[PDB]
Amino acid sequence: QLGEMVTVLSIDGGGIRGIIPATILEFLEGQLQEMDNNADARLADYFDVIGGTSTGGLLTAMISTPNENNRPFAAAKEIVPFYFEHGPQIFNPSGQILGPKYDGKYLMQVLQEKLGETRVHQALTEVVISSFDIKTNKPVIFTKSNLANSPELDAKMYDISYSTAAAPTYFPPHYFVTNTSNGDEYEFNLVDGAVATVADPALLSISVATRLAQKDPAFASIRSLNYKKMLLLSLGTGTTSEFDKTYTAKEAATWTAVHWMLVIQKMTDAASSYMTDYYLSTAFQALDSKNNYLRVQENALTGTTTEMDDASEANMELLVQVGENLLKKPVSEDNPETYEEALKRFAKLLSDRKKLRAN
């Protein structure tokens, strides 16, 4: 039964490369608008869970936060323009001797302007936005489902959105406070969700959905790990394996802490993409439901496109092009089905499931 299926969207971290999954989501949301004869159709109307880390978490906030009309704040086609307009200002070097490359002031200001005073409890869907708390030394995952037992986690969307993207050495860590059930203050000292090993948060997102299945009847079909009843769209921001951008053990033997810090996050984020995709492929293949899991990832980033913080006009235009080209790429080797075709199929499933539930 299509009707009882659970739908999950997950978007990887990757700074300015967030243009790639936003281009994919522009295509998908456009397909849903066309099929359902509704120009106001939004991703949040079709997905039960939306997960994201860093810029993927920023995107999650923009498409799940309600406006004045209780409709998603941003259309998927407004995200790439957001990156072109605000990306150069977010990634404007502070030039300060000590501290990170960026002071994070513009990033906080634009998040505050766009999200207002909205809180995670107002999200139009279940959201999964990651961070790591350097004071408690634990991952801090923001969701709606855990607000019943943890009301202190009902933070402001701009606090969550800045925190999930606060990459060490790029932006300063974020501090903010909330209130507990008995009025006590609850503090957060947060850095980017990539530090919590979820630069790819797709497995975390389906785990939150699986936990919800134990208490929420709308998620009941996936209780007992029946991922045959789950539809998962996982979007990457690309990786690189071309020798011009990678390293040898020989040259790295004399590297100091400064050189290792510049590359350690790119390596762990690539690893999170490969490892999470491996866990998920294993799970969906074990239930003979491989085609329920669509991973849209760019495997060969080249030139300036590898850098997380290059918000030059030329690099952002190259990122739109890698996204548009990714649509025409095959889903795998030996399978001529393109990403565009698999996304049209996914769109149709999302539309049919929404229709069946309305009956």
Residue numbers in the entry: 24 to 382
Sentences copied from the publication:
Patatin is a soluble 40 kDa non-specific plant lipase that is expressed extensively in the tubers of potatoes and other members of the nightshade family. Previously, the crystal structure of a recombinant patatin isoform, patatin-17 (pat17), derived from the tubers of heartleaf nightshade (Solanum cardiophyllum), has shown this protein to have a modified α/β hydrolase fold containing a central 6-stranded β-sheet sandwiched by 9 α-helices along with a catalytic center composed of a Ser77-Asp215 dyad. This fold and active site configuration is reminiscent of the human cytosolic phospholipase A2 family of enzymes, but it is distinct from the traditional Ser-His-Asp/Glu catalytic triads found in serine proteases and esterases such as chymotrypsin and acetylcholinesterase (AChE), respectively. Recently, interest in patatin and its homologues has been heightened by the discovery that a diverse group of mammalian lipases, termed the patatin-like phospholipase domain containing proteins (PNPLAs), encompass catalytic domains with sequence similarity to patatin.
Overall, our structure of native (non-derivatized) pat17 is similar to the SeMet-derivatized structure described previously by Rydel et al. (RMSD  = 0.27 Å). Pat17 purified and crystallized as a monomer in the asymmetric unit. In agreement with results presented by Rydel et al., pat17 consists of 8 β-strands and 9 α-helices arranged in a modified α/β hydrolase fold with a central 6-stranded β-sheet consisting of five parallel and one anti-parallel β-strands sandwiched by 2 α-helices in the front and 7 α-helices in the back. The catalytic Ser77 is located on a loop between β2 and α2 (termed the nucleophilic elbow) that contains the classic G-X-S-X-G lipase consensus sequence motif. Ser77 lies adjacent to Asp215 creating a catalytic dyad defined by Rydel et al.. In contrast, the catalytic dyad of pat17 functions with Asp215 acting as the general base that activates the catalytic Ser77 residue. Two portals were found to flank helix 7 (α7) with the first portal (portal) being 16 Å in length and lined with the following residues: Ala190, Pro191, Ala 217, Val218, Gln288, Thr291 and Asp292. Comparison of the DFP-aged structure of pat17 and the MAFP-inhibited structure to the native pat17 structure yielded Cα backbone RMSD values of 0.19 Å (DFP- aged vs. native) and 0.12 Å (MAFP-inhibited vs. native).
